[model samples]
Target: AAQTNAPWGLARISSTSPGTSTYYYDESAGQGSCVYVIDTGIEASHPEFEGRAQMVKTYYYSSRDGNGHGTHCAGTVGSRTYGVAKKTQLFGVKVLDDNGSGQYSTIIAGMDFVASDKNNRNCPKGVVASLSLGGGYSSSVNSAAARLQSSGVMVAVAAGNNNADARNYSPASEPSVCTVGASDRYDRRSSFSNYGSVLDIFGPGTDILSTWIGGSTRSISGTSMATPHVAGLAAYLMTLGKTTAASACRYIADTANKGDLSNIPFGTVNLLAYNNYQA
Candidate 1:
């Protein structure tokens, strides 16, 4: 079996098929709304996204360029290399550095900043938040996410990439959060995507095209890549016609391609047939 990237999954639970049909595309979010991405900071100058980036806030929790992991992750979620979410505003929070690691305190602080924003000064409330980082679940993390949700903030998290029955920590496993897993173009599990009753949905994760730092582009693999696909979808939905994460997830899940029972993890999800509802 192949390995998967941890701390990266879709915050919402659904995705739009690239070109199969048109029903899934709805104009719900309108314009001016935003989605907060709590990950490594974005380039803010990628050609494909010159004026499209509406970054109103930023935070660097760790030393920059410790590993370049955040740059790659940024490309996946907000990069315009291939035009993922063409019109959504991205509020980046760099809670981790290049090494793809950061302290939990940093993560919580970043979340607090976004969640508590009132003037729309930084990243305000009612915006969707995508957290592709997690260690494991804890009461503190759970309280933060729940509070955000109660405030009408939509939070998306990555189901662990461990391919284990139990999902990774904190955000992904939280009930109020939308936990995402990874699937291939074929809609099959990516061999390394964590699976369990807690898993919400899957998205394109293998060999995906995205942006990188230094004005570059490339193909990378991981549930991290997959998480952004769903983020883009949610952002797109926010632009077209949706506001809440739960509704967006239902829309994609109800409209995605499905697979055979035997091909899925627990026989409840249709891997290939999921696309049958794609409009």
Candidate 2:
């Protein structure tokens, strides 16, 4: 049998403190619970993450990977120690095949899976959904996201990797969706990171260190890498006794580092400073 990939290596950045680094939702402490990541398959057995992450559920619309994009994206979001939110449970929703592309219907199917609570068998209800894909925004997509939001599911999305702000769509632009933009090592807005009034928050995206398939390691750039940072921070806040979505959002924005907004775009935001506060 082929060997499972090892978890990607962790590169400590100025933003992440070693001794102080804490999992957003501490399952051991029992403050809050897990969230679902509706993305490609996550390598559960990555060495850096082995026995540390959870694969609550998964849905594969495409059997094979298109070009390993989805798998790489998954690692960026949930690659054990490399990921910002290591303890958060994930619900992988594989919409894209090996070619790194999939039909809109397939993506929509993933959204439906994230929203519906029908059988309650696979993903169940009440898990946060993180969407890393982007395309044209539509009423149908907005309606779907709105329903998920109305139902109290936390929906996080990438702000798209395109350097230009034009032609963006779906979950990211939708109201109530947590749109994430990319930043570089210095926390400056990455040139490739899409920008607009629709942008919700920003996170480390350029040269982001995370896990990859086959135990390989690499850095990726895109809004996809950015979303997980917020998700991880949100998971941490949830574990800190925050229950409502509004509170969680406020906590992250208010506590985020805002002193140096010069580098960040107009509406750029960060995780709350309260993150440093003790229980």
Candidate 3:
């Protein structure tokens, strides 16, 4: 089967200690978790997904991968080879169009659909919503995330790629959601990543290699690339019965690497660290 050899993002969190020189890979990591990727649609038939990906619903566009963003993010979240939660089920919730843009109402609608159990899209255990797209702050999106969180669904959002304060953006600035920033291979904050007190954590986002649309693989960069790592981790934690979204977020923060960032300000912010098992 087609697979990505080593996902450094996964290794960062699965190690015995923060900044460990060695780490191990587990193909069966997220056996019972489910991640709902809210973005452009995913290539459901991609070989890397191995039939484990489902297109649950689309908000403003057809339920297909017109843009490669969602598929790439989905691969990072749950594909067999390029993912963190390799064995987890993936559900695509399309909210963005081919141009990678969407209305706040459309994005909220997608969140509502995933929170509902109407079409068997909602997982029994829990769901982690992975949103890589962002614009300005939206009260509606914040409320939506709060609603989902109350029902045990965790939402992970990108901290924006503008290199400014993430608090200036929606979803990322949403207090209820886990806002993730980007870090390069050397563990420094990516040059383009937004920072500030609002960010919940940092993850690998530079030149990240993952499954693309059309059954292929590619590398991309952005805080958009960083959010999925947190989403996948949250899903894996949920599978281990971390019921509350807040709890999962706390666990992740408490277990992160405390001192691996060149940007001390963001270094003080939560930098992701791998924990193979739930505490």
Q: Which candidate is the best by TM-score?
A: 3
Q: Model 2: per-residue lDDT, tens digit, 1-279? A: 111232211221213432222233233221133455555555556575555444433345433333445445555544554654454455555665555565777677667776664235232222466677777877677667667656666677788877655236776778677777776655467777877766666666777667666766677778887777666566555655564443555556666555443355444454312244332
> What lDDT score goes with residue 274 in model 2?
26
At residue 80, candidate 2 shows an lDDT of 56
What lDDT tens digits, residue by residue, belong to model 3 across residues 72-187? Answer: 99999988777877778898888999778899898888878777842375455567889998888777777887777666677888989998898778878888778898987777
TM agreement with the true structure for every prediction:
0.77, 0.77, 0.90
Rate residue 211 of model 2 by lDDT: 67
Candidate 1 per-residue C-alpha lDDT over 53-99 given as tens digits, one digit per residue, 9 for 90 to 100: 54344445432333444445555554534434545566666776666
Model 2, CA-based lDDT: 0.56
Better lDDT candidate (2, 3): 3
Model 2: ten consecutive residues of lowest lDDT: 1-10
Residue pairs with colliding backbones in model 3 are 12-274, 13-274, 13-275, 14-274
Predicted structure with the largest lDDT when compared to the true one: 3
What C-alpha lDDT values do all the predictions have?
0.56, 0.56, 0.78
Supply the global lDDT for candidate 1: 0.56
User: Which residue ranges in model 2 land beyond 4 Å of their true spot?
Assistant: 1-32, 51-67, 117-126, 263-274, 277-279
